[model samples]
Target: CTVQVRLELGHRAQLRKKPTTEGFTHDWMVFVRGPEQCDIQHFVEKVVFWLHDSFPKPRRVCKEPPYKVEESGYAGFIMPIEVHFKNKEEPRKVCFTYDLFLNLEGNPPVNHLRCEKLTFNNPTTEFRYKLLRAGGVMV
Candidate 1:
């Protein structure tokens, strides 16, 4: 048996004030959110995202149900995301590929949302129900 999971996550970059550092531009925020009416903390434990390699610590982690990060950069780049399950039953750290963009025209709030789905094959008996609580309906 298999269970299906859904995660709505993305980037929301707002243009930073002028006279910037001359390189880094937008004030960007990346987030991982569950369905509109559900809290992902019920199943998801934490989130980790890596910005450009130039940063001090490329990897950043967030938790407390609001898995997000706010930073600044000059251009769009391919980034990877990591997700940790709330329970030990799911023993693997799921990975995701993401593209952070600053190319969109106009001012701040240049945001884009994408849906990520995961299928749990033979989910641990105790963990299946946790998916339900986070609005991840089994398919």
Candidate 2:
């Protein structure tokens, strides 16, 4: 007899993409995961590098690596990836992304949430969450 096993593992990352909008910016909170056994860390790393390549840096670029689970509540960190068109300008606008890794047994559930748009002056952004597995069963 063949036994079926389901495994749930995923990551949540906040992505902000400003596609040269007029007086406004585009932002997205993307959560990615699958039932297959895959390296969450590598996925996140690829996502980071993907965003970096998609959004070209005019002058300066900054990246804050993913934080440890102990230091951070979730399995990821809120990283503010900034791109500056000019050194004299105040960043013009800022881009931020956060990545979270979760592993569970059985199927993974889909969940999402939206928060108020945060604004800051010379600001550093912070994101937090309590990741939970919805439900699971074994037969």
Candidate 3:
């Protein structure tokens, strides 16, 4: 009943220079570690929901996998996405670890997203099916 979520740089060459700054930047791709049968979309949605709820004025660009978001300030720079099941159920949680790149020559600033990792347990059948029904039936 365990799941490991990993975040890695999608492509180093894809990194773009910040428009307002002299540093490179890129978005990390978040992935679930396991067989394809695992409900990755389910977990990704939960994570995105948690992130928006936790952070203020978050910019959510995509609702699907490899979800993209941007926030200002150092505090907002680093945030964790946690997922918990219903009250009666044991919580399925995932935490993040960041690998940041920094430049020290001039004014020190975060260069870009280097890497990140999230670890948690797989959701139960009840939680998975419940979410699927909420949207699956409509589609």
Query: What's the TM-score of every candidate structure?
Result: 0.85, 0.23, 0.37
List candidate 2 stretches off by more than 4 Å.
1-88, 95-97, 114-116, 120-139
Q: Model 2 misses residue 106 by how many Å? A: 1.8
What is the alpha-carbon lDDT for the whole of candidate 1? 0.79
- The whole-model C-alpha lDDT of candidate 3 against the native structure comes to 0.37
Per-residue error (Å), model 3, residue 5: 7.7
What is candidate 2's TM-score against the reference? 0.23
TM-score ranking, best first: 1, 3, 2
Lowest-lDDT window of 10 residues in candidate 1? 16-25
lDDT tens per residue, model 2, 1-139: 1112122222333222332333222222333332433222221222221232223441222222221211112123333333221113343433445343232323243234323122223322211000012111212
lDDT of 3 by residue, 9-115 (tens): 21111233452242324322332222333344554433432232444544333445444444322222233444333323554444453332223334434434434
TM-score of 1: 0.85
What total of clashing residue pairs does each candidate reach?
1, 0, 0
lDDT of 1 by residue, 22-139 (tens): 5666778888888778777878878989878988898988877678888777777888999889766655568888888874557546679999888888877668888777777766
Each candidate: what lDDT?
A: 0.79, 0.26, 0.37
Candidate 2, run of 10 with poorest lDDT: 127-136
Candidate achieving higher lDDT, 1 or 2: 1
Instruction: Provide the lDDT at 30 for model 2.
Output: 38
- The true-versus-predicted C-alpha distance at residue 78 of model 2, in Å, is 7.3
- Single out the weakest 10-residue window by summed lDDT for candidate 3: 7-16
